[PDB]
Amino acid sequence: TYKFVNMREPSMDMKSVTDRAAQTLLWTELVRGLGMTLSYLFREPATINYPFEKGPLSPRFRGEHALRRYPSGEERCIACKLCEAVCPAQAITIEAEPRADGSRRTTRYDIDMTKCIYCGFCQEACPVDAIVEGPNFEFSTETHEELLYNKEKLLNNGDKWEAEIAANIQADYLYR
Amino acid sequence: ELVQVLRRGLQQVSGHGGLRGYLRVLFRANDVRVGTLVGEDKYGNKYYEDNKQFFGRHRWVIYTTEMNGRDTFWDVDGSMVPPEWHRWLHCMTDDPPTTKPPTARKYIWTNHKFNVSGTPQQYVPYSTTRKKIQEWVPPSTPYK
Amino acid sequence: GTSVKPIFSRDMNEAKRRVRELYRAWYREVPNTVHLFQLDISVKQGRDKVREMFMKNAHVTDPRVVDLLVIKGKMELEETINVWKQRTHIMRFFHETEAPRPTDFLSKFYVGHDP
Amino acid sequence: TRPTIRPRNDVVHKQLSAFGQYVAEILPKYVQQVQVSCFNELEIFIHPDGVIPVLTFLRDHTNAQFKSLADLTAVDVPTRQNRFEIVYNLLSLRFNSRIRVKTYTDELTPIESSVTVYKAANWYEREIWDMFGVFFANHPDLRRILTDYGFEGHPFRKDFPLSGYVELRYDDEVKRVVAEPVELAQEFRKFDLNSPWEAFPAYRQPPE
Amino acid sequence: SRGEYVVAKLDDLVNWARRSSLWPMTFGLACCAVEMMHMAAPRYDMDRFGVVFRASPRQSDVMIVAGTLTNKMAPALRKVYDQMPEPRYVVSMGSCANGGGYYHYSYSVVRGCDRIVPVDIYVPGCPPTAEALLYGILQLQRKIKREKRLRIWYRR
Amino acid sequence: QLIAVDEKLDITTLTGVPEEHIKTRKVRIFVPARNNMQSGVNNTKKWKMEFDTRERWENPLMG
Amino acid sequence: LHHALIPHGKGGRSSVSGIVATVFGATGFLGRYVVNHLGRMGSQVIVPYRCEPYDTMHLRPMGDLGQIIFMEWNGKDKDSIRKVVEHSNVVINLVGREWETKNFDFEDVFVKIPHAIAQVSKEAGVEKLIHISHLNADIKSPSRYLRSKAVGEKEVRAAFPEATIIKPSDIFGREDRFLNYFASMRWFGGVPLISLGKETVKQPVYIVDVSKGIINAIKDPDAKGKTFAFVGPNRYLLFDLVQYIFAVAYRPFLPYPLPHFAYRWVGRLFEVSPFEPWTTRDKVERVHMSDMTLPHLPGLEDLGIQATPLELKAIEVLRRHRTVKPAKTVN
Amino acid sequence: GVRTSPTGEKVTHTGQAYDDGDYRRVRFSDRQKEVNENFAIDLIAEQPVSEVGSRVISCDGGGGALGHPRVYINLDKETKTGTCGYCGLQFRQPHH
């Protein structure tokens, strides 16, 4: 089924022509638009008082990256390199070796924040949930160099945001 | 009517601790609303809510004037909010960390840090791997 | 045999006259192009660059390749005369920012592994 | 075929097969092959000399009348003698159908411009020339459309490098944007993803 | 002495004046620009911070690069930067403008707008959220507040 | 309507490749060997063309 | 050679050249060219700045990521010099001022600061040090500029015996005072030259030539304790040089002789301004003096550079001063 | 378990420290070096060994679907203890 948007024919009787002439001469629709704007002024604005108020978010929100660890305190990452393989932008660089106790751990875990597209494929490819994309988004920088993260920066981010990250994962892990 | 809006304005003036506190909040947050105190932060931030406001303005934070090492009477920023109050303030949950606190871990930071860009505490990238190729060291004793 | 379809020409003579025709157009344009883009080069060395670019393709012995190169040269002429290019596009022909790459064996041996 | 499998539609397959035979009969001078895919798509393989006739037929015949050109593109297969293949996708609103016409060419052989048949083809052929280097005869104005001015080579070609040959920066000594040979800080990482143990037996090739 | 006090006060006044009214011209190169226009939307209201909406290049103070910078566009952006009055700043918005991003290994993309113009603030994300861009703009304000020109001229 | 010219094809002047990436490179045409970690042979069916390996160095920043 | 300092790559933006250079006075006119040439080949440049970082922002796109590091310093402190040159293997000195400020006179700028830099570099183990002095530097020079230049040259050679001294001759360029300085006067109507400029000869040198000479001297191994004189190809009288400068700028040129004492008076009046002066007494006296000639000193050609004549770059420098017939040279 | 390099830098968990002659330390002047203070090897070493009276024990890291993939560890070798390949926890049969 289809509709016509502009298939009306104006009436040509004297009253209709006089109405259209009154519209032309007295600017009635212009006054209607003015009235719409005037009414729209007297309503409450939609502005929030940033940074004292914040926009709504979701537990699924993808922000700054972080490396998590187990409750015992050992890092969850096992250097499987699945996040590196899935990364659509090749933003992850990983190097690994056996630890002094024989554990399978990374020696290098770099993510380029300036090549990252913040898609979240890395955190969903991770088997042990080692890497997550946390809720932080206010991490703007004055130089390009500080946006090149190494393993220490990501581990520090994890230790910094672990409470909120764990709460969000608890809220959302039944959808994954 | 008009008398009632003036009464609510006077109530807002009286609810901020007088005229001094009213001017303080007006010049620090550009707002004079009063709401129920939801919680107090270990760094000095105060958290208020008012469910009669529309979504987005129903929760707000009054920042502390002195965080880790700087004077924050004027230079406030959104990175000063700790992660638990960050989750509450961004409406990621309906539960403040006061009613139900987050899980405690030994590795979690006990002192939240703000954004340290443009500061001697800023992050500087570096390679974390060891040298790959080791060079030969010539002997120190003469051969002849 | 090896019958192939023409583009514009049938033999090297028509290709040569097209190349010559194209060359004349470029020659006329250079003084004007130099003035309009406010280039710091002289007309002499601009035309020497033209000569070098034309001599780069002097070993071609195929009318299809020759007149396709003529088509590309005509496309370039078009971009310059219509001022679609900028000063940087024209100055990309001279490579004033690239360091000189040595050619002798010893220098190449000293700089790195590249032959 | 239980719910996870895409349902088939044999009526459209039969209709497209019959119409392909019809078009093949009417134009034996140029049509070299006709195929219908298992998802009901009709493609017609023709000779390069028949671009203007066949398209015109498909646009003007009462039975076909594909009056809209949906897309015109090129595909590069370096292993073939005729390197590039030209693909025309046409839509018929009268019969609510789609058709595809394929042609071949190499670096030096021009393809007749179809701007006269379809007005839409003019930009498409400009992009094909820009990205693959296929020259189109009698085009109103054939020139680069997407690449930078003075760009050397065609990016879409298989042999062309992913990052190109030159990169741009700003030089303060000459006070302008200059171009130098590409020097990546981190080289793009090449992944060998193809596995042994073939996936689809239905596409296995003779062992020659 | 009073010589340092007067220049300190005048410097504070000048810094407050410059950071309390930042007039940006925006290169809406790609998808990052859409979040740009959401920072001018009623919810965030950039204009309430003194940041005017769509200032002209002749009287702009900060350059916001929002989107991918191709090789074909870099000279135009450089010319627009060169046409700005001296107290000028550049804000690199989004991953494409920061480091090439998701087209980093492309033959026609500038791997970061900082190859062309110097950058003051880098805003991460693809695209960075409106609030994230607001945070970056506010950060630029603090950076302007931290600068000191009359003091340097006095000690020099 | 046909030139019927007899000469080897040469498109080097049309591809836009720089001169020192034509006369200096050395390509290799080969059938890739089977990975001995696996017994599948599907990766040894086609022919491959690849260029010679050049210098790869360590980035001073981030290595 | 400290493997991390072994050259790698193809000499480009993301290559490694094995050079760690600390360029004092990099925010000046020659400093930007030196830093650009150092960074475009993959070297790491440490830049010390006393000025607001906004003024140093123009050096950011000159190198790769992390290849240019900015540090604060001041000449009165030896700790800042130590921390700025601690890890560098090359030190380049470009600190200079054409006028004397209240806190820094020519002894501070050309003598004490270079001597402190050289002494700290020697104590820090810096392999190469390059110092810049004027061509006309002599102990008996009437102007304190060149006198302090000569004293600083002596004291640097004493503090750093293996230092390389470079003596440019009145560098000219796009952001150069010399080409620009002459063009600027047109505002006062007439141009005043002592003795109508008929008794002064000059030897102008291109900025790019000097920067390339510094780079090659860094590269050249046998130029450890040598002293170079960077001069242009053509010598000109002052009068016809200014005439050519005004001709390129399409500005009417009127030259009127002014007494030497009278010229000095104008410079003194000018010297009063808080802001940088158009001219100073030392500058007027310095400009009038003819450039020396030292054929015994190794020149720019010894560094494999062909000096560029001023006629090629005069249009480049002076096109902005507007809204052919090169000057005659003496040899 | 953060140690200190002989020159003065903090040694990271990976063990990378710039050498005394390395120019690359110049990047840390007037700034700091990002080092994580929690070393995972020591933290997992502090964990007590679990005692189970089973010949084979299963581990998933704790949390159910919030841990690692569930694996089975054999405890027949009395000389050593069974270690989880993901989480690093240790298990042992009740000897004597």
Ligand SMILES: CCCCCCCCCCCCCCCCC[C@@H](O)O[C@H](CO[C@H](O)CCCCCCCCCCCCCCC)COP(=O)(O)OCC[N+](C)(C)C
């Ligand atoms: C009559 C003669 C006129 C001569 C020319 C002068 C022109 C008029 C001068 C009057 C200008 C008024 C200046 C007042 C500005 C202070 C505003 C105050 O609110 O700033 C606070 C303090 O900031 C600065 O420290 C204020 C410094 C301003 C200068 C101080 C005194 C300067 C007076 C000297 C005038 C003498 C002129 C002599 C030459 C003729 C913090 O604000 P800010 O941080 O931004 O915003 C934070 C946003 N938050 C709160 C939401 C998070």
Ligand SMILES: CCCCCCCC/C=C\CCCCCCCC(=O)O[C@H](COC(=O)CCCCCCC/C=C/CCCCCCCC)COP(=O)(O)OCCN
């Ligand atoms: C018995 C004795 C009486 C004597 C006779 C007197 C009778 C008077 C009857 C006629 C009077 C009407 C004249 C008023 C002006 C009319 C002009 C007019 O109509 O022109 C319009 C144009 O009008 C406009 O478009 C103007 C719009 C501009 C935007 C302004 C917004 C309007 C609302 C603002 C409020 C106005 C406030 C007015 C009072 C100001 C007080 C100082 C025609 O244009 P179109 O419709 O496009 O058709 C032309 C193609 N044939």
Ligand SMILES: NC(=O)C1=CN([C@@H]2O[C@H](COP(=O)(O)OP(=O)(O)OC[C@H]3O[C@@H](n4cnc5c(N)ncnc54)[C@H](OP(=O)(O)O)[C@@H]3O)[C@@H](O)[C@H]2O)C=CC1
């Ligand atoms: N034609 C020419 O210009 C030739 C120049 N000379 C010599 O070449 C050297 C550099 O030349 P040029 O670049 O053109 O001069 P500039 O005036 O352009 O630059 C001088 C540099 O030295 C720094 N500097 C000056 N004074 C001090 C100070 N008291 N403390 C710390 N830093 C200071 C400046 O920093 P800031 O901006 O913060 O003050 C600035 O970076 C100079 O030593 C000069 O004598 C050689 C022959 C002529």
Ligand code: SF4
């Ligand atoms: S979010 Fe996407 S682009 Fe970013 S690191 Fe993870 S996989 Fe790569």
Ligand code: SF4
């Ligand atoms: S996917 Fe997870 S466990 Fe695997 S390398 Fe990435 S972060 Fe480590």
Ligand code: SF4
């Ligand atoms: S940075 Fe991301 S969001 Fe912005 S234009 Fe690029 S791809 Fe789109």
Ligand SMILES: [Zn+2]
């Ligand atoms: Zn486990």
